[PDB]
UniProtKB/Swiss-Prot annotation:
It comes from the Eukaryota. Induction: Up-regulated in hepatocellular carcinoma (HCC) with high intracellular beta-catenin. This is Palmitoleoyl-protein carboxylesterase NOTUM. It is found in: Secreted. It comes from Homo sapiens. Rarely expressed in adult normal tissues. The keyword DNA-binding does not apply. The lineage of its organism: Eukaryota, Metazoa, Chordata, Craniata, Vertebrata.
Length: 343
């Protein structure tokens, strides 16, 4: 079980001004630290943030969080469930900022909600150094869905924060699960681009520095898209992405005749193309959403290699390897052409 700590700096808050926090399970003598960013969509204006506060309040407030959480999947401490990092220090960072982990804006007289995702991550990293993170060799910043995109937006800032804090020996790495999206055309029109452009303004959202310098003012929304932000990042990042992600299909208004068949097959081919130059990646041809904190995340395989194995091989490469691949992208063109897809 992971134990809740609310942030001692209570100026770093969830949407409604309640303190943000993290769940921690320490593993003595391990120098590996896994900080996992929860996902759960976002809200981009007052009206739809008000709606989310009614029916998704735990994603906007710590007032009702439980004292504990069970670590599952890559957060499990049992080798049977987590062959990769079962002995690591485990941190689960609840998503309570509704900003894809990009915000740095306090709740004030002019803002009904605080959007502080990017500062929550920094504050968690700050307060953990006193609980053992100072001795770490590896800090793996992981995340699923909106949290996977949050890895891409924050991993280099976590590295820079630890460098200027005097810890250049901590190797910061990223693991982005189901946060690698395409700014593509919808199957039936009316869409992520405009929602993110409004979100960034509404949140005062911040993006990684080099990506921001390429796309410049007014165009920061581009850096929320994995295939655009990833080549600008310095930290090593492992990308896990279903070829037919359910959240991708949702925003594409896909819920089978030729037109839809071609649209789906072209989507999978476009996703494969954006991953061709990502050296550490795991991308199975399944219709699904998230994987790394699911208890049965050991079950899926690409070209006969599981995700926990691919992650271990990635570890080794950061010391090609024989029989230990790190780039695993399905080539088959339709959901569940991979037989190990989740049922
Ligand atoms: O958090 C979840 O479960 C949903 C997935 C994350 C939100 C999201 C959905 C669709 C497209 C996106 C594009 C960029 C960032 C985020 C995008
Ligand atoms: C608390 O967090 C805010 C936001 O990052 C920061 O401006 C302030 O310096 C922090 N205070 C302390 C005591 O850490």
């Amino acid at each position: 079980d992971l134990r809740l700590h609310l942030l001692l700096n209570t100026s770093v808050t969830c949407n409604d001004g309640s303190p943000a926090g993290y769940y921690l399970k320490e593993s003595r003598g391990s120098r590996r630290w896994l900080l996992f960013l929860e996902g759960g969509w976002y809200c981009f204006n007052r009206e739809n943030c008000d709606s989310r506060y009614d029916t998704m309040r735990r994603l906007m407030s710590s007032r009702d969080w439980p004292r504990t959480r069970t670590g599952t999947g890559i957060l499990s401490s049992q080798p049977e469930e987590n062959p990769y990092w079962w002995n690591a220090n485990m941190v689960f960072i609840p998503y309570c900022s509704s900003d894809v982990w990009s915000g740095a804006s306090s709740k004030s007289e002019k803002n009904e909600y605080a959007f502080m995702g990017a500062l929550i991550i920094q504050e968690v990293v700050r307060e953990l150094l006193g609980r053992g993170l100072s001795g770490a060799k590896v800090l793996l910043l992981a995340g699923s869905s909106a949290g996977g995109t949050g890895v891409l937006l924050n991993v280099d800032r976590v590295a820079e924060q630890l460098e200027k804090l005097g810890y250049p020996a901590i190797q910061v790495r990223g693991l982005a699960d189901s946060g690698w999206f395409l700014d593509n055309k919808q199957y039936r029109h009316t869409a992520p681009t405009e929602a993110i452009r409004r979100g960034i303004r509404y949140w005062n959202g911040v993006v990684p520095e080099r990506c921001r310098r390429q796309f410049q003012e007014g165009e920061e929304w581009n850096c929320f898209f994995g295939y655009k932000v990833y080549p600008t990042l310095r930290s090593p990042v492992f990308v896990v992405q279903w070829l037919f992600d359910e959240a991708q299909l949702t925003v594409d208004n896909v819920h089978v005749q030729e037109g839809l068949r071609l649209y789906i097959q072209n989507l999978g081919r476009e996703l494969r193309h954006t991953l061709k130059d990502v050296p550490a990646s795991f991308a199975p041809a399944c219709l699904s959403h998230e994987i790394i904190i699911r208890s049965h995340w050991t079950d899926v395989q690409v070209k006969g290699t599981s995700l926990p194995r691919a992650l271990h091989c990635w570890d080794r490469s950061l010391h090609p390897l024989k029989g230990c691949p790190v780039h695993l992208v399905d080539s088959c063109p339709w959901p569940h052409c991979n037989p190990s897809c989740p049922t």
